[PDB]
Curated annotation (Swiss-Prot), chain A:
It comes from the Bacteria. GO terms for biological process: translation. One of its GO terms (molecular function) is structural constituent of ribosome. SUPFAM superfamilies: RL5-like. Belongs to the universal ribosomal protein uL5 family. This is Large ribosomal subunit protein uL5. The gene is rplE.
UniProtKB/Swiss-Prot annotation, chain B:
One of its GO terms (biological process) is translation. Keywords: Ribonucleoprotein, Ribosomal protein, RNA-binding, rRNA-binding, tRNA-binding. It comes from Deinococcus radiodurans (strain ATCC 13939 / DSM 20539 / JCM 16871 / CCUG 27074 / LMG 4051 / NBRC 15346 / NCIMB 9279 / VKM B-1422 / R1). This is Large ribosomal subunit protein bL27. One of its GO terms (molecular function) is structural constituent of ribosome. Belongs to the bacterial ribosomal protein bL27 family. The lineage of its organism: Bacteria, Thermotogati, Deinococcota, Deinococci, Deinococcales. GO terms for cellular component: cytosolic large ribosomal subunit. The chain holds residues 12 to 85 of 91 of the full protein. Part of the 50S ribosomal subunit. Contacts protein L18. Binds the 5S and 23S rRNAs and also the tRNA in the P site.
From Swiss-Prot, chain C:
This is one of the proteins that bind and probably mediate the attachment of the 5S RNA into the large ribosomal subunit, where it forms part of the central protuberance. GO terms for biological process: translation. This is Large ribosomal subunit protein uL18. Gene3D superfamilies: 3.30.420.100. Keywords: Ribonucleoprotein, Ribosomal protein, RNA-binding, rRNA-binding. GO terms for cellular component: cytosolic large ribosomal subunit. It comes from Deinococcus radiodurans (strain ATCC 13939 / DSM 20539 / JCM 16871 / CCUG 27074 / LMG 4051 / NBRC 15346 / NCIMB 9279 / VKM B-1422 / R1). Part of the 50S ribosomal subunit; part of the 5S rRNA/L5/L18/L25 subcomplex. Contacts the 23S rRNA. Contacts protein L27 and the 5S rRNA. One of its GO terms (molecular function) is 5S rRNA binding. Belongs to the universal ribosomal protein uL18 family.
From Swiss-Prot, chain E:
The keyword rRNA-binding applies. PROSITE patterns: RIBOSOMAL_L16_1 (PS00586), RIBOSOMAL_L16_2 (PS00701). Part of the 50S ribosomal subunit. Contacts the CTC protein (RL25). Keywords: Ribonucleoprotein, Ribosomal protein, RNA-binding, rRNA-binding, tRNA-binding. This is Large ribosomal subunit protein uL16. Binds the 5S and 23S rRNAs and is also seen to make contacts with the A and P site tRNAs. Interacts with A site tRNA mimics, and is probably one of the key factors, along with a helix of the 23S rRNA, in positioning tRNA stems in the peptidyl-transferase center. It comes from Deinococcus radiodurans (strain ATCC 13939 / DSM 20539 / JCM 16871 / CCUG 27074 / LMG 4051 / NBRC 15346 / NCIMB 9279 / VKM B-1422 / R1). GO terms for molecular function: rRNA binding; structural constituent of ribosome; tRNA binding. One of its GO terms (cellular component) is cytosolic large ribosomal subunit. Transmembrane segments: none annotated. Belongs to the universal ribosomal protein uL16 family. GO terms for biological process: translation. HAMAP family: Ribosomal_uL16. InterPro entries: Ribosomal_uL16, Ribosomal_uL16_bact-type, Ribosomal_uL16_CS, Ribosomal_uL16_dom, Ribosomal_uL16_sf.
Length: 177, 74, 104, 53, 136
RNA sequence: UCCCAAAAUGUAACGGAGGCGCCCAAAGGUCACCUCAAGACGGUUGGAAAUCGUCUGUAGAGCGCAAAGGUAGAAGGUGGCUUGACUGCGAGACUGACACGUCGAGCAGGGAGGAAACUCGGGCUUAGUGAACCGGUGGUACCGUGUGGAAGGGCCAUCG
RNA sequence: ACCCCCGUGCCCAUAGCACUGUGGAACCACCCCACCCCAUGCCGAACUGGGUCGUGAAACACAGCAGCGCCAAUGAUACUCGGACCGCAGGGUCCCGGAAAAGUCGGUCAGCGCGGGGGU
């Protein structure tokens, strides 16, 4: 399951387009961090289990409810209260979710056209602006609580953006041409 | 306001060159300005003291970390 | 990242101890088990698993620790104070300790 | 060292057989019930020691 | 003129000039020759007056902002502590401190503006010229 | 707690500012592990800050409160185990006119954490408190006016 | 003896960052696997167990480079111990010594140890 095409359709295609002197210097995929927007405007102790469970069924891993940064501004901010969520996928579980996103996630989306081609993180990384959750093969509105959005971040080991974009698309990433 | 005030104290008590004894208090301070060197212990209130007999020795490595050691005679 | 190794260096008192200290470098597959003086920056017995290993780079964790204690008998060491780096005292590093604590 | 109805209190020390006080400033603010410990009184030591009056 | 926010009170002490320079931010300058205290109001005195003599330009620099609060006597008595928090601000000035400096105008046009803005001051002053090149 | 205070210490005013009369079964002991503020770039209920990621970053943060000193090898942040916030002591020093106050190695009877060296007799320290008399409670048995008890009185601790 | 690598000190920026080059199986790192001893309040990233290939890219080591940091004269000056004076005063001067800061010249990106290992 995967990994085989992760190399053949990537590594060898890079020295035949660029010029790597090493199979180690070849841009790789480090981790895929998923962030969850919770609380703040929607301070609900019930909404917490809403994401806590779903996130644990879509990525197959218990997430961590990252609290506040202990900052109290003028609006609704408190000292140390669950408001964020962290779901870091790396290694085996990474490609497991990743593959599902390239085969079922992105393809199966209403009004889907692709993703912004402009170079995002200028450090060799990339970021995704996922929104609606009613576009996943694990999310079933017929057996949940409500409807919310999730953020996915692609962390790689690329040096430049030129070597990053290549890696993403070859691995499986659609763009609006 | 005129009201409020405090006698305070602090400072150094055994200066360098001096011959200490087992229990003599060396320097009093609030923080960790003078770190306990060789032969020198440190109290709750960062109050430096001597373990045995010897001579007071100051060491400075360009500020920041102060040290006080005790070189025995014998 | 470099904090684990220093937290055991500042911790292990040097002078007031009066003792010696045994270091250990097992982040790889090349333990030194080097022994170092408390004041003088020298080395006495100095073990290592560099001279052959008989195809073993992990199992000799206890072989070198037995070799050490025995190598220390030729100098005159009774007390040793260990000073691991980023090592939570688990297995590969535990074998040294145990082997050089009963073989001495 | 004021002493009123306010939260926290000064506590007497008892013991299993032992008859000794430790004098400790507790507080009914948080977990306020398990004021038990282990303070050996002049004795063999190792006696069940709850300051709980 | 006045500070936007400070501690409030101060003290009093006059040493020699430190951060005063012969020429910058223009061609001609005006320097004091006696230590004293230059009130905020006195600065308005000088600035406004030099603006009457200079219709256009706005090349009048004043880098002696007063940073020194002074107390005052409210009525009488002496049975009290800090009296008169808000009185006036004074900027200390030592011989060789440049208070004023102008440019664009000629020689005559400058001998008048400093002159005039010299009679208001509690101390003597002299007007100088360029030929200084310390730091930059 | 700073300044005045004039480079030991000390030093006054109805001189200039800001706090305390507490808190914590953990913010303790110890044992392990993590490293900050902020800015820029790019990202979804955001659109200022914040949640995430990657770089810069002697830390411009944090340390329960006021302030200074000090801390990156932590006195920053977490977890496991515990009740050393122990008892009987203390060479020798700081400080005060006295009385108080402050620091403390080591020794003993017993325990705590760690493999261990080792550390621990409250909390980064400096405020969070007050003599004696009188009385309350527990403990222990010294006195107890003829004797043996008892009332009471003393002592240890501790409360008002 | 030559040199290099690794580990560990003294020293704790005149020994630091950046830029660039060199190093490939002796050493180092990445990397590979990791159901279990052990562990990340989520992730075997980091700890950790068992070990090939590959590569030196990154990290690290070394070397050049000193644009930036750091260190920093000489001279003079500020100030001041001592002595002696002036103004109504805020202040200021002379004699005799000590003597800054900053800036400038300039300096240098170390040096000095121990042990072990592999090469000539
Ligand atoms: Mg003084
Ligand atoms: Mg009376």
């Amino acid at each position: 399951q995967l990994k085989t095409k992760y190399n053949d359709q990537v590594r060898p295609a890079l020295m035949q387009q660029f010029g790597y002197s090493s199979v180690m210097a070849v841009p790789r995929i480090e981790k895929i961090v998923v962030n969850e927007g919770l609380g703040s405007s929607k301070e609900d102790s019930k909404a917490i289990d809403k994401a806590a469970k779903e996130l644990a069924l879509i990525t197959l891993q218990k997430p961590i409810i990252t609290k506040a940064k202990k900052s109290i501004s003028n609006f609704k901010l408190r000292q140390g209260m669950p408001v964020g969520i962290k779901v870091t996928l790396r290694g085996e579980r990474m490609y497991v979710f990743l593959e599902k996103l390239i085969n079922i996630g992105l393809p199966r989306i209403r009004d889907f056209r692709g993703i912004n081609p402009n170079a995002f993180d200028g450090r060799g990384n990339y970021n995704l602006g996922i929104k609606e959750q009613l576009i996943f093969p694990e999310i079933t509105y017929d057996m949940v609580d409500k409807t919310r959005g999730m953020d996915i971040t692609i962390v790689t080991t690329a040096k430049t953006d030129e070597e990053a974009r290549a890696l993403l698309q070859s691995m499986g990433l659609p763009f609006r041409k | 306001n005129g009201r409020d005030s405090n006698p305070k104290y602090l400072g150094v008590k055994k200066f360098g060159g001096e011959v200490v004894k087992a229990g003599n208090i060396l320097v009093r301070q609030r923080g960790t300005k003078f770190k306990a060197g060789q032969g020198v212990g440190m109290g709750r209130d960062h109050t430096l003291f001597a373990l045995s007999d010897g001579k007071v020795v100051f060491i400075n490595k360009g500020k920041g970390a102060r040290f006080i050691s005790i070189e025995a005679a014998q | 990242r470099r904090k684990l190794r220093t937290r055991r260096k500042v911790r292990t008192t040097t002078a007031a101890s009066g003792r010696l200290r045994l270091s250990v470098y097992r982040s790889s597959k090349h333990i030194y088990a080097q022994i170092i003086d408390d004041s003088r920056g020298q080395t006495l017995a100095a073990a290592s698993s560099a001279a052959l290993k008989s195809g073993n780079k992990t199992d000799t964790a206890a072989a070198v620790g037995k070799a050490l204690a025995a190598a220390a008998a030729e100098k005159g060491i009774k007390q040793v104070v260990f000073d691991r780096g980023s090592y939570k005292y688990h297995g590969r590093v535990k074998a040294l300790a145990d082997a050089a604590r009963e073989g001495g | 060292a004021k002493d009123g109805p306010r939260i926290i209190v000064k506590m007497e020390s008892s013991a299993g057989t032992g008859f000794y006080y430790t004098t400790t400033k507790n507080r009914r603010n948080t977990q306020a019930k398990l004021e038990l410990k282990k303070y050996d009184p002049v004795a063999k030591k190792h006696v069940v020691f709850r300051e709980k009056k | 003129k006045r500070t936007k926010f400070r501690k409030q009170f101060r003290g009093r002490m006059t040493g020699d000039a430190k951060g005063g320079d012969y020429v910058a931010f223009g061609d001609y300058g005006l320097i004091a020759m006696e230590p004293a205290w230059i009130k905020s109001n006195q600065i308005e005195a000088c600035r406004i007056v030099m603006s009457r003599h200079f219709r256009r330009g706005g090349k009048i620099y004043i880098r002696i902002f007063p940073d020194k609060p002074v107390t005052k006597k409210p009525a009488e008595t002496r049975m009290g502590k800090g009296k008169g928090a808000v009185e006036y601000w004074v900027s200390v000035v030592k011989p060789g401190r440049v208070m004023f400096e102008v440019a664009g105008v000629t020689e005559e046009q400058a001998k008048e503006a400093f002159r005039l803005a010299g009679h208001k001051l509690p101390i003597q002053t002299k007007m100088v010229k360029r030929e200084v090149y310390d730091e930059a």
